[PDB]
Nucleic acid binder design. Structure first.
Ligand SMILES: [Zn+2]
Ligand SMILES: [Zn+2]
Lengths: 279, 177
RNA sequence: GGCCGCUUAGCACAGUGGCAGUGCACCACUCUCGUAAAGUGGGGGUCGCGAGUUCGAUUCUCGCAGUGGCCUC
């Protein structure tokens, strides 16, 4: 059961606009250039397509996000040599970029100038079974043996997809985080600020692994990781590139893929990568 | 007592980026000074030997030689501080704003304060994205001021790509004039 | 044999009677954690092919060349 993690967004809304009806094609062909010269589309209103046919017949939209201009409409009438009637319509104010289904969802009222968004590959049928085998083989058993009450219970594995999803390196017992220490436990377990920190923790079980493959930077590998990496392991995954991340049980207290801030979706960062839940 | 920026500490931090620039590592240098040493009484440039001996730990961007692509300056000096020996209450002065990684590690170690001279938008932990006071517990946070000696901090970093790389794929390297 | 679909730049795929497009890319350019990344702009096309229709066809009409799915042998 893979649940793809995507940045939440709001559905688009509609703002008023003014349209008209067009009977002959050549008049509309001239009207395209006439409107381009007279009333160019606003930068926020360039996400639409002027060409449109009535459901019952051709009806043409003229003004976006407001009423028509008087002089522009008069010149349009003079070009048509006939009176122009106006019927109110509505145009979208929010631009979608990630969902093809949402992109089509409002296509009934009007199409979008921006084409169908590039649909990410929906993995494959056999790679799901490979993920299940790796879970039942490596990451989950560690989270079973790694934790007695004293060690935290987080395990992360750098899997190589090219060789049939084989474990290149797996974090062990001597790599995990102690419960008593509070330096490591802020990210993953709640209320770690209550207890003082006996030691200094620099490497979590997601950064120990990424520093054992240098033997470019893990570019193009994959990382099954049980509990969801914190904000530090998020930069572990973003400076050291990684194609996909599969966290099983999310961290509500602090996490760079879930609760705190979805790091992989941040625009200014170089390497954007996909994250799939697997419960 | 309190903590204030001290000029000589930032001079040491910025002169700890030129040495790493000669080595060819990205010019980011960090200086961990003693917690009760950043006091106003030490603001003056007097006693340069004593001031530069009070410096507890210094680090540079050792990622080129090490091979660990996840070891900036901040992650090195803290190791040195650990090696010479704690809750990292020492103040940390760096030339570029800590990346999200460093801003998370310093949060986890309860750093008292982290000054930086320049703001790096591509990877910035106290700039575009804020881990200064993001964590909510239940009281875990640090502070960071705007910028000191930014012109040098950007000149040293621009002098990096003007000279080319070395380890690179012949196709993927840039033969800039 | 039959039937259904399909052919568009180096590649992968839209799209429609009147401007010929979009992702990867042969490449070029701009920058603050190598600039081995990411944004940005340019050029890249016989839209099987032929005949017909149309002021005008990649589109519409027919046939032919090709591939693919099922069926028949
Ligand atoms: Zn972590
Ligand atoms: Zn950093």
């Amino acid at each position: 059961s893979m649940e793809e993690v995507v940045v939440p967004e709001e559905p688009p809304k509609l703002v008023s606009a003014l349209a008209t009806y067009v009977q002959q094609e050549r008049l509309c062909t001239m009207f395209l250039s006439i409107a381009n010269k007279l009333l160019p589309l606003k930068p926020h209103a360039c996400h639409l397509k002027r060409i449109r046919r009535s459901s019952a017949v051709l009806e043409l939209l003229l003004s976006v996000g407001g009423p028509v201009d008087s002089s522009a409409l008069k010149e349009l009438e003079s070009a048509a040599d006939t009176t122009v009637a106006v019927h109110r319509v509505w145009v979208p104010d929010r631009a979608p970029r990630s969902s093809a289904e949402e992109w089509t969802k409002w296509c009934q009222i009007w199409p979008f100038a921006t084409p169908k968004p590039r649909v990410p590959t929906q993995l494959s049928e056999c790679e799901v079974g490979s993920i299940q085998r790796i879970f039942r083989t490596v990451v989950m058993p560690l989270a079973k043996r790694l934790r007695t009450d004293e060690t935290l219970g987080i395990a992360a594995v750098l899997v190589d997809p090219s060789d049939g999803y084989r474990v290149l390196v797996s974090s062990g017992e001597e790599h995990a985080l102690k419960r008593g220490n509070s330096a490591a436990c802020l990210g993953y377990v709640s209320n770690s600020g209550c207890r003082k920190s006996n030691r200094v923790v620099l490497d979590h079980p997601v950064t120990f692994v990424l520093k054992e493959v240098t033997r470019y930077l893990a570019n193009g590998m994959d990382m099954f990781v049980s509990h969801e990496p914190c904000v530090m392991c998020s930069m572990a995954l973003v400076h050291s590139r990684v194609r996909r991340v599969f966290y099983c049980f999310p961290n509500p207290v602090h996490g760079g893929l879930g609760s705190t801030v979805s790091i992989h979706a941040i625009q200014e960062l170089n390497h954007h990568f996909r994250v799939f839940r697997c419960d | 007592e309190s903590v204030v920026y001290c000029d000589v500490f930032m001079q040491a931090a910025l002169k700890e980026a030129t040495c790493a620039l000669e080595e060819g590592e990205v010019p980011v240098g960090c200086v961990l000074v003693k917690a009760d040493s950043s006091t106003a009484a030490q603001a003056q440039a007097g006693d340069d030997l004593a001031l530069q001996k009070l410096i507890v730990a210094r680090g540079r961007n050792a990622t080129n030689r090490k091979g660990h692509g996840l070891a900036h300056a901040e992650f090195v000096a803290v190791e040195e501080l650990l090696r010479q020996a704690d809750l990292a209450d020492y103040v940390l002065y760096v030339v570029v704003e800590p990346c999200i990684m460093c801003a998370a590690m310093l949060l986890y170690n309860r750093v008292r304060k982290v000054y930086f001279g320049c703001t790096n938008p591509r990877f910035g932990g106290n700039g575009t994205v804020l881990s200064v006071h993001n964590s909510y517990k239940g009281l875990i946070g640090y502070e960071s001021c705007g910028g000191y000696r930014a012109e040098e901090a950007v000149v040293l970093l621009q002098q990096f790509y003007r000279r080319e790389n070395t380890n690179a794929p012949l196709g993927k390297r840039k033969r800039k004039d």
